[PDB]
RNA sequence: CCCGCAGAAGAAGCACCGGCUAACUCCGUGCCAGCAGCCGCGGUAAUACGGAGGGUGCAAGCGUUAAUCGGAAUUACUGGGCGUAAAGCGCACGCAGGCGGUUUGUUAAGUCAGAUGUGAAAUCCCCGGGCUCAACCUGGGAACUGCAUCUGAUACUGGCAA
RNA sequence: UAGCUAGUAGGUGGGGUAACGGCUCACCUAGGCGACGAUCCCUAGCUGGUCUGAGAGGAUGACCAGCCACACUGGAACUGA
């Protein structure tokens, strides 16, 4: 049931006395399309091994998002290093309007309609961390009413 | 019920004429800050009463000179 | 020099919540008391009180639900350098209604929901989420 | 001077006039004082075809406005059909 | 202003039966449906996200025989209308007259339906409508004028349409060769292999 | 950054400058070729690029690149030039339009014929 | 606009295929010829040059050039920064200017609420109608975020008094 | 581009205009504008609107419509509502 997605794979290098050693890193995101999403970063000598390790790591360390009918509860802002992300709930049918990393994470987390935009650096790793952080720091009417000691009707 | 303005005398060095200053508090179009703005008028004052510093009510009337088109109505806080 | 006591009050609330303090204290004024009443009725602080005859001190007892602070974010909107006024139509929706903006209308200080229901505008003191 | 006449709007070969009261000196489609109705010569069935505000027209005529021949015929037709 | 090329080549490139042939035979018996056209067809194209969006949009366009300018105008109208943009776009496309006559069965394919419409075989509400993109409204009646009612292609296509699945938003009498557009179709009535959200995102890029 | 500071001195836009000044906001310009010659590109390239010094109808004298394989351009030939710079060729910011007034289409072309002014073969 | 005759008969091109960017092979050339928006390509296996086949995108158009906005949060009001990346005056005093602890009263200037007048028509938007459809034309509405006047509220800011 | 202005700012009287007025003349007073940008230089017809933009904004003022100015260059009056 877990949809998985590879966002980026890069070839990093490490200069040694005998020459250069090229290894491959893979950033992947996995999610159950119904409010649970995690990201993993995997490092290996080859691309298949790197994606395998990243998929396993992302299949672990998932977190839970409070989704409202495939859309966000309210506008959220997220930030990690030099990437700042803004996500807004949108009416049904607009689809997912977001850049590549945000597109992947939201599509795998199960948000079907959202307006998004990334400011600052669009480096995929930090963009994924920031959007996941923003999705996690989002509160729903149930929890907000419980936290403030009110009913959901009282909060409207 | 007659449209009038209320300002402060800035000079009374002319015969039958004062230059008052109407101050208006207006929001800046772009930045939203409320900025103080001044408009300088020349006012005809028969009897040459009004002194510098007074608060005067002025009413717009027919032209009386090249630049004078406002006339004095009363003096408020005549104390300088 | 202290030129925004309301902003100072919000800053004390924010810092006390970040430092897990049970209660915070500040010099009192009637605007501060009105704001604290609004916060108490909206359920963002647990309690407030005033102690003192000549120099009243406002004490707010802060609220935590699951260890975490109740007030997630609180930001002064109208400030001495830039006053913000909104007509009844343009009153903001903070966190799409999950939070509250404190608006000072002509009938007293209230939330944006109360001002929109009463058909009034006014000054925007702060947002609370 | 002040007259009530038709300004020719619409497209090529499909006219649609706008009964407006205007100063005679102005252009046909130019400055006008008030719009008092419309007239569609290529009108089909179940369409108004001709709508004139008789009250405002009477007001302007009483103020001295003249009526172009076509507008007079339209007024006659309206008051004869209804 | 109309695609006159090989249709099964389109169906192979999209990798799906687009119903561009009458259905007397199997598309696998008429072509190598599993292989993309051209010399390098056996290749496995790892099409990117832009690739999948483009392929979806092209699939819908090649299903309905609509060029890009008109399709984009359709999208603008659908997004302007209230509701859901993808369902509105599919509703407009289904409301195309060619599509309607193909659905009711006076044509083996939409190309044949369009040929009838163009050659003035079709009447909506009693008047001959030549324009293929004409938008039929609910409660409209679409009938074939007699001088083409005698034509055999209509009969053969009607038999094929009886063979096919029947629409739920159209009611047809084959003997009278007339039909009624009862209501606008829905996403419950439209083929779920289409993914309109890809098209919405594509045109919102 | 302060509102008061911006009130006293608004944000001042960086004034964009055009990369093809001799065109004077025109899509093309006619000129009279003053010298046809070859030049050497900047390295990491090595070739003999064909350029011409041209006097434009507005008084500008500019260097224009002659693309394609084969040119009949000599002194006093009237050509049409368009924008577009040859990156590895300092001082050259324009292209000659082949198939225009006197720049004939390159012979024996079958692709980009519209780009090189070549009529359709029979 | 309608009817009749004849006969598929009179009607498909342009750009691109190294990445960004949808779509790849062969042959010719060999740091030359040349390509090029950027990164970049070409020194004898070139998917980047030229031709061919195949394919992709638009289509009576298709490309190139010029120009504006966008992307550019890259003049940042919404919406930015200033230890080391560009960026705190050597340091202080201080006029104009910007901001103002706390309570009560009064005013109603800012602020808010309502009403009237005006904000030309066309244009944009919504619901309809007419040209076979559309473009187009057109009825009604909404809008024109504004301005001025009158009547109220006084919380906050301002004025005045203590 | 930091100072500009002698009919220059105001006043009494006469004349002038369809009309108020330094509009003009005589006299008197010594003012008036300006750092909330006067004066000077460069560019420019203004608007409803058009394009772009999620919006705020940015660019723009072809066609249609309202207003202004000009009619080879400079000046002036006559006729006339
Ligand atoms: Mg780690
Ligand atoms: Mg950056
Ligand atoms: Mg005057
Ligand atoms: Mg066309
Ligand atoms: Mg590709
Ligand atoms: Mg070779
Ligand atoms: Mg350009
Ligand atoms: Mg910008
Ligand atoms: Mg920066
Ligand atoms: Mg430095
Ligand atoms: Mg220092
Ligand atoms: Mg105060
Ligand atoms: Mg007031
Ligand atoms: Mg219609
Ligand atoms: Mg209309
Ligand atoms: Mg209007
Ligand atoms: Mg007060
Ligand atoms: Mg006199
Ligand atoms: Mg000029
Ligand atoms: Mg923007
Ligand atoms: Mg302008
Ligand atoms: Mg005369």
């Amino acid at each position: 049931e877990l949809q998985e997605k590879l966002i980026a794979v890069n070839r990093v290098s490490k200069t040694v006395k005998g020459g250069r050693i090229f290894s491959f890193t893979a950033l992947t995101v996995v999610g159950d399309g119904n409010g649970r999403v995690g990201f993993g970063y995997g490092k290996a000598r080859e691309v298949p091994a790197a994606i395998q390790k990243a998929m396993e790591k992302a299949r672990r360390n998932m977190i839970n998002v409070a989704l409202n009918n495939g859309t966000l509860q309210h506008p959220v802002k997220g930030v990690h290093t030099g990437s700042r992300v803004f996500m807004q709930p949108a009416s049904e049918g607009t689809g997912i309007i977001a850049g590549g990393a945000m597109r992947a994470v939201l599509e795998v987390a199960g948000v079907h309609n959202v307006l998004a935009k990334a400011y600052g650096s669009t480096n995929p790793i930090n963009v994924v961390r920031a959007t996941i952080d923003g999705l996690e720091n989002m509160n729903s009417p149930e929890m907000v009413a419980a936290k403030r000691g009110k009913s959901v009707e009282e909060i409207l | 019920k007659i449209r009038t303005l209320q300002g402060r005398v800035v000079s009374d060095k002319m015969e039958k004429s004062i230059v008052v200053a109407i101050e208006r508090f207006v929001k800046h179009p772009i930045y939203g800050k409320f900025i103080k703005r001044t408009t300088k008028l020349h006012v005809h004052d028969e009897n040459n009463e009004c002194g510098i510093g007074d608060v005067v009510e002025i009413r717009e009337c027919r032209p009386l000179s090249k630049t004078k088109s406002w006339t004095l109505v009363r003096v408020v806080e005549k104390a300088v | 020099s202290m030129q925004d006591p309301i902003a100072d009050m919000l800053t004390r609330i924010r810092n006390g919540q970040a430092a897990n303090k049970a209660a915070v204290t500040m010099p009192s004024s009637k605007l501060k008391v009105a704001i604290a009443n609004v916060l108490k009725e909206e359920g963002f602080i647990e309690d407030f009180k005033v102690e003192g005859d000549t120099k009243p001190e406002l004490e707010l007892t802060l609220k935590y639900f699951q260890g975490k602070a109740v007030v997630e974010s609180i930001q002064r909107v109208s400030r001495p350098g830039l006053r913000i006024y909104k007509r009844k139509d343009e009153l903001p929706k903070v966190m799409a209604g999950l939070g509250i903006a404190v608006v000072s209308t002509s009938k007293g200080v209230m939330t944006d929901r109360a001002a929109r229901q009463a058909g009034l505008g006014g000054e925007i003191i702060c947002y609370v989420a | 001077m002040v007259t009530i006449r038709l300004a020719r709007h619409g497209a090529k070969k499909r006219p649609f006039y706008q009964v407006v009261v205007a100063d005679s000196r102005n252009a046909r489609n130019g400055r006008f004082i008030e719009r008092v109705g419309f007239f569609n010569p290529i009108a089909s069935e179940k369409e108004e075809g001709t709508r004139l505000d008789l009250d405002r027209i009477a007001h302007w005529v009483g103020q001295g406005a003249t009526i172009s021949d076509r507008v007079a015929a339209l007024i006659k037709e309206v008051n004869k059909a209804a | 202003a109309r695609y006159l090329g090989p249709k099964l080549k389109l169906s192979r490139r999209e990798g799906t039966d687009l119903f561009l042939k009458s259905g007397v035979r199997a598309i696998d018996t008429k072509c190598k449906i599993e292989q993309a056209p051209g010399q390098h067809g056996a290749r496995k194209p790892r099409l990117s996200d832009y690739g999948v969006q483009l392929r979806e949009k092209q699939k819908v366009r090649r299903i309905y025989g609509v060029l890009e300018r008109q399709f984009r105008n359709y999208y603008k109208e659908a997004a302007r209308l209230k509701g859901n943009t993808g369902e509105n776009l599919l509703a407009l496309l289904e409301g195309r007259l060619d599509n309607v006559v193909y659905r009711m069965g006076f044509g083996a394919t939409r190309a044949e339906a369009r040929q009838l419409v163009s050659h003035k075989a079709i009447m909506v509400n009693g008047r001959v409508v030549n324009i293929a993109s004409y938008q039929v409204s609910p409660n409209d009646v679409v009938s074939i004028r007699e001088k083409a009612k005698k034509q055999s292609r209509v009969k053969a296509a009607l038999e094929l349409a009886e063979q096919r699945e029947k629409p739920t938003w159209l009611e047809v009498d084959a003997g009278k060769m007339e039909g009624t557009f009862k209501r606008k179709p829905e996403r419950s009535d439209l083929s779920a292999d289409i993914n309109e959200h890809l098209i919405v995102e594509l045109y919102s890029k | 950054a302060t509102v008061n500071q911006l009130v006293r001195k608004p944000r001042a836009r960086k004034v964009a400058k055009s990369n093809v000044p001799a065109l004077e906001a025109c899509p093309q310009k006619r000129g009279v070729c003053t010298r046809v010659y070859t030049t050497t590109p900047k390295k990491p390239n090595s070739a003999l690029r064909k350029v011409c010094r041209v006097r434009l109808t507005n008084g500008f004298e500019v260097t224009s690149y002659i693309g394609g394989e084969g040119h009949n351009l000599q002194e006093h030939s009237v050509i049409l030039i368009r924008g577009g710079r040859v990156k590895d060729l300092p001082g050259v910011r324009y292209h000659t339009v082949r198939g225009a007034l006197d720049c004939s289409g390159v012979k024996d072309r079958k692709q980009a014929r519209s780009k090189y002014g070549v009529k359709r073969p029979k």
Side-chain angles (χ1 to χ4, degrees), chain A residues 91-97 100 103 107, chain E residues 49 53 83-86 197 200-201 204:
Chain A
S91 54
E92 165 189 342
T94 180
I96 168 184
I97 301 180
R103 170 171 313 276
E107 283 177 359
Chain E
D49 43 320
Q53 302 185 337
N84 171 284
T85 67
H197 28 102
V200 177
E201 290 166 79
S204 176

Side-chain angles (χ1 to χ4, degrees), chain E residues 39-51:
Chain E
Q39 175 188 144
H40 313 295
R43 305 199 173 274
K44 230 292 185 187
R46 308 205 172 183
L47 64 168
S48 60
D49 43 320
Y50 165 75

Side-chain angles (χ1 to χ4, degrees), chain A residues 18-127:
Chain A
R20 292 118 184 249
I21 303 309
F22 302 94
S23 53
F24 292 84
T25 73
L27 170 71
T28 194
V29 182
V30 312
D32 58 354
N34 223 14
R36 293 173 56 86
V37 55
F39 81 106
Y41 188 70
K43 215 168 159 49
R45 296 290 288 275
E46 300 94 5
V47 182
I51 68 168
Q52 173 66 13
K53 195 181 310 180
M55 290 295 188
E56 189 275 321
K57 190 178 301 300
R59 278 194 226 249
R60 202 178 65 255
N61 194 33
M62 292 192 301
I63 67 185
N64 198 277
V65 186
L67 236 55
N68 177 41
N69 302 327
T71 318
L72 288 77
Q73 303 286 3
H74 60 69
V76 295
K77 302 196 61 61
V79 45
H80 185 88
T81 68
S83 58
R84 299 159 186 84
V85 148
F86 175 80
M87 285 165 289
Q88 198 205 330
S91 54
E92 165 189 342
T94 180
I96 168 184
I97 301 180
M102 312 199 48
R103 170 171 313 276
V105 55
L106 300 161
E107 283 177 359
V108 100
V111 182
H112 277 101
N113 305 272
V114 52
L115 298 171
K117 165 138 266 296
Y119 309 104
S121 69
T122 55
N123 191 255
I125 307 173
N126 301 136
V127 173

